[PDB]
Amino acid sequence: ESKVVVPAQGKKITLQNGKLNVPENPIIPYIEGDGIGVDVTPAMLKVVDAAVEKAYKGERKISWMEIYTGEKSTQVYGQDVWLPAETLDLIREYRVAIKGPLTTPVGGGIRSLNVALRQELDLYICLRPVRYYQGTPSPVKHPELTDMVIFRENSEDIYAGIEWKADSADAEKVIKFLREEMGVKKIRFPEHCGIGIKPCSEEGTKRLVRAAIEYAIANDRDSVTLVHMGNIMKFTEGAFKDWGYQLAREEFGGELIDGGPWLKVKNPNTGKEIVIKDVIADAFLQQILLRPAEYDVIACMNLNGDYISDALAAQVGGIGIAPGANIGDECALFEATHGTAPKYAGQDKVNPGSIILSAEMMLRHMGWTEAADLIVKGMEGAINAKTVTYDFERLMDGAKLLKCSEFGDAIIENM
Amino acid sequence: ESKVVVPAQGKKITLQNGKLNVPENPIIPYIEGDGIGVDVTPAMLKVVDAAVEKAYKGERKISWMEIYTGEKSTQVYGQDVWLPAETLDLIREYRVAIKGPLTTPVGGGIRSLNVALRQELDLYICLRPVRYYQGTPSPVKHPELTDMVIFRENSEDIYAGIEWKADSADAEKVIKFLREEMGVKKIRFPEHCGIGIKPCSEEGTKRLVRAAIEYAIANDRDSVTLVHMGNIMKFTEGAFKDWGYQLAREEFGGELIDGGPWLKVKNPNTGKEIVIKDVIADAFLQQILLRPAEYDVIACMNLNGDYISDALAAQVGGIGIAPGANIGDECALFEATHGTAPKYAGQDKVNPGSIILSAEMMLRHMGWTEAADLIVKGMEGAINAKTVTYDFERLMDGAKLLKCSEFGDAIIENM
Ligand SMILES: [Mn+2]
Ligand SMILES: [Mn+2]
Numbered sequence: 001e002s003k004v005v006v007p008a009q010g011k012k013i014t015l016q017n018g019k020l021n022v023p024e025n026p027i028i029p030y031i032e033g034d035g036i037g038v039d040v041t042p043a044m045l046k047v048v049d050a051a052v053e054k055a056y057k058g059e060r061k062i063s064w065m066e067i068y069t070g071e072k073s074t075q076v077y078g079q080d081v082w083l084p085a086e087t088l089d090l091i092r093e094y095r096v097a098i099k100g101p102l103t104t105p106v107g108g109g110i111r112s113l114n115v116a117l118r119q120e121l122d123l124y125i126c127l128r129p130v131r132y133y134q135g136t137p138s139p140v141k142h143p144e145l146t147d148m149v150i151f152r153e154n155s156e157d158i159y160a161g162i163e164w165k166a167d168s169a170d171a172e173k174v175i176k177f178l179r180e181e182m183g184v185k186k187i188r189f190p191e192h193c194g195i196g197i198k199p200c201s202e203e204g205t206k207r208l209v210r211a212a213i214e215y216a217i218a219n220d221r222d223s224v225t226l227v228h229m230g231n232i233m234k235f236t237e238g239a240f241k242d243w244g245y246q247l248a249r250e251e252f253g254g255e256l257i258d259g260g261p262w263l264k265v266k267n268p269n270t271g272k273e274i275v276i277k278d279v280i281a282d283a284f285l286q287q288i289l290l291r292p293a294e295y296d297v298i299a300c301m302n303l304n305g306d307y308i309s310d311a312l313a314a315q316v317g318g319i320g321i322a323p324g325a326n327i328g329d330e331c332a333l334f335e336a337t338h339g340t341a342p343k344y345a346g347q348d349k350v351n352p353g354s355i356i357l358s359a360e361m362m363l364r365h366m367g368w369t370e371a372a373d374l375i376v377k378g379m380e381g382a383i384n385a386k387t388v389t390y391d392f393e394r395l396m397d398g399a400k401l402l403k404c405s406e407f408g409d410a411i412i413e414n415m
Numbered sequence: 416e417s418k419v420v421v422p423a424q425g426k427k428i429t430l431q432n433g434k435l436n437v438p439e440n441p442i443i444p445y446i447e448g449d450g451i452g453v454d455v456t457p458a459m460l461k462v463v464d465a466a467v468e469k470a471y472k473g474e475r476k477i478s479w480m481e482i483y484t485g486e487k488s489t490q491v492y493g494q495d496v497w498l499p500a501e502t503l504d505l506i507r508e509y510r511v512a513i514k515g516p517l518t519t520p521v522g523g524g525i526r527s528l529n530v531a532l533r534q535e536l537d538l539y540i541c542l543r544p545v546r547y548y549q550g551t552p553s554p555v556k557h558p559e560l561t562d563m564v565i566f567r568e569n570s571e572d573i574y575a576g577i578e579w580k581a582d583s584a585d586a587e588k589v590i591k592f593l594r595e596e597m598g599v600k601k602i603r604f605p606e607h608c609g610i611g612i613k614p615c616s617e618e619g620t621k622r623l624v625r626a627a628i629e630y631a632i633a634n635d636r637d638s639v640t641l642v643h644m645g646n647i648m649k650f651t652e653g654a655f656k657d658w659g660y661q662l663a664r665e666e667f668g669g670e671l672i673d674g675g676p677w678l679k680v681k682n683p684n685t686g687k688e689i690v691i692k693d694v695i696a697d698a699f700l701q702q703i704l705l706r707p708a709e710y711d712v713i714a715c716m717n718l719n720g721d722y723i724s725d726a727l728a729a730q731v732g733g734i735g736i737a738p739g740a741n742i743g744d745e746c747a748l749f750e751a752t753h754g755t756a757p758k759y760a761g762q763d764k765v766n767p768g769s770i771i772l773s774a775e776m777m778l779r780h781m782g783w784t785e786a787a788d789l790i791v792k793g794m795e796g797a798i799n800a801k802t803v804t805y806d807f808e809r810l811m812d813g814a815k816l817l818k819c820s821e822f823g824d825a826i827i828e829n830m
Contacts, residue, residue, distance in 0.1 A: 104646075112646065112647060115647070119601070119603075122603075139555055139556055139557070139704045139705055140554055140555050140556065140704070141554055141555065141556060142554070155603045156603055156604075158573075158613055158647070158648055159647055160601045160602065160603070161601055161647070162593075162599055162601050162602070163613075163648060163649065163650040163651060164650060165649075165650045165654070166615075166616065166617060166650065166654055170597065171650075173596075173597070174597060177592055177596075178577075178612065181588075181592075182585065182588070182589060184577055184612070186534070186575045186576055186577050187575065187577070187612075187614050188534075188537075188570045188571055188575070188614070188616065188619055189571075189614075189616035189617075189618045189619050190616075191616065191618075192616055192617035192618065193614050193615065193616035193617075193619075194614070194615050194616070194650035194651045194654045195612065195613065195614055195650070195651070196612070196613035196614075196615075196648055196650060196651045197593065197599070197602075197610065197611070197612065197613070198573055198578075198610065198611035198612070198613060199602050199603070199604075199608050199609070199610055199611075200581075200608065200609050200611075201581065201603065201604035201605075201606065201607055201608035201609070202581060202604075202607035202608075203604045203606075203607065204603055204604050204608075229718070231519075231527065232527060232530070232573070232574055232576070233573055233578060233611055234578065234580075235578040235579060235580045235581065235586075235609035235610070235611060236578060236609045236610070236611045239580070239581055239609045281722070282721050282722050282725040283725065285700075285722055285725050285726040285729070286725050286726065286728065286729035286734055289554045289555070289726075289729045289730060290554055290729055290734065303644070306697050307696070307697050307700055307722060310697040310698065310700050310701050311700040311701065311704075311726065313701065314700070314701035314704045314705055315704060319701055319705065
């Protein structure tokens, strides 16, 4: 029987015509998360509650409902229950949910639980905004020049988990097929060879890029850059770029800039000309360091997005405070983006900034922009006040060391 | 008939027992390169000649022999001759060669010429050393902490170029096979879907990692880090890491550090304990910025190596002066690692540092360490003297702007 307790006081969020109908007392499911999730989640719940209390003068209140996935799920539901069917059901049912870090066990043949949540709920958009918070210790000279929003495709690519082990009957069957029926000659060593499949479809590309352009319009952003490796992988990465440009022309009236290949899309609300461009992935990894100001909204495939989001997060000193969301047409799951750091679990020491900023993305998604704005204001003030957790403090002079919970308070104090 | 002219005075380098037998007058084939290759190559030839002249007091001299590939090949041999069979023959025959930037035409279905050279000559090692040259304008606060050597697998991965276009009969045939015969259920959108194959074999992994460990030993380096995405791609990326560790244990007497997974390999020459470790690729992209000093020799797959080498190059202000080599068991091809920058072609303006440093790797490979040391010394002095090309000068105050050829001279002047 389920151990999830539906809050007595609280109402389910609904969806109509692609628009969320959020009540003043929405029930929001939440997954504590493994390791440090035990530290960061409580801080997040408190910070969010303070923000909504302050924003709406007590008129609104979230009814938190704990659901399970990861190590805590096995302890709650038993041995092999890492991701209960009900968790997928609950998230879809309640439309909006948030979670702490999740880790996948090894030795049992289980694949990434985070990817499982994304794929099964068809949360095709991995949204990762990366900006700099003044006062954050950064390894680069000008982190303030970074203000990007990453739209990472979440349902395709080699991330789909389609592969076969070297020397397995399956791997041999696939390789035999490729060489004998497809006439593949480029497999250098066909024996003791593992094989992986990289898919990229038009509908997959289009829906991701459509969300990216709509975001640029809704937020009056300057450009959308399609990042890819089309010079090497023409039919997957290259096709992604092609379809992205095509979508811009076919659905957003994209016009040609100069002699190409860049396009301009008129923002139907502000009249601003949004530039649609593209950059090779490896070169992009260099450009984000050398010319970050030239970039804004980014649309890319799964793997590249993973790399880009992490590299960007590192550069602005936000490795531990990078917010993230997994969005689909029916529901959305916000999440801490860092690891579980089991060594510090329960020490009330780690930075709760990632899950908190992911909660602010959640609040904004719910249309509760005022509360979200309060969290941003709180984070900015606390960091600028140099009252921070160890991960920041260690790289600074004259900073006040704060525990995880205390930093949560500092955020509230700066709202 | 061939238009390649074998130098009258000069002798072919030979190979015996995996050791190059280099004469005092070796014939070295060279490809000018497209675009700025017309600017950088002449500077390289002059710098190298000055270095060997100075090092061996006139006793040794390279007999340069021009060979063709790229745009110049079509102009020399005709319309469809982008990569002549003789070029592959010449490189293998003469054992050591160098080249400027190469570009691949689009619209003709031709795949990367650089990859073609690597694959066809089985140059399985893409060696990319990245260090900081004092005085180089860098976007990071402490670029001097970066001193890494990248061993990028060059014959496998999605880089192999195995893929099929969306809606093509082939793509449909492969997808049908995967779904109906392999029972694949993770292809989100099977229609209008491009497909790519990612292979990774044991022999491919082992030979790359073997070269990496041997390099760490020969150069008394501190560690070898296997970079991979094994948490997501278990059978390719994960297998690479597994085989890498296995090779360390089976061939280099690797012993377990603590409770694992790190290993220690005793340097048979210095007694130094070389640490063998591994890091997830996305996290590595962050670690190179946050903790670069903890890394040294890196061994990774094709695509990841491409990303890692570029990101590292950018961080140390070496985007345009990053040396590179493609090494195999029978021959080696050194190359400029940047693009062709056609806009500046013939202006004697671009930085010849990349091809020059690649020539120093070439000289060292030939056993001409003294000449190679002279080039390093020259580069260090010129950069530190702030007498540089526009790409550096633009990011500095109080620097003396030098043309491409003039920077070549500056290098010579600092030998
Ligand atoms: Mn990640
Ligand atoms: Mn490259």
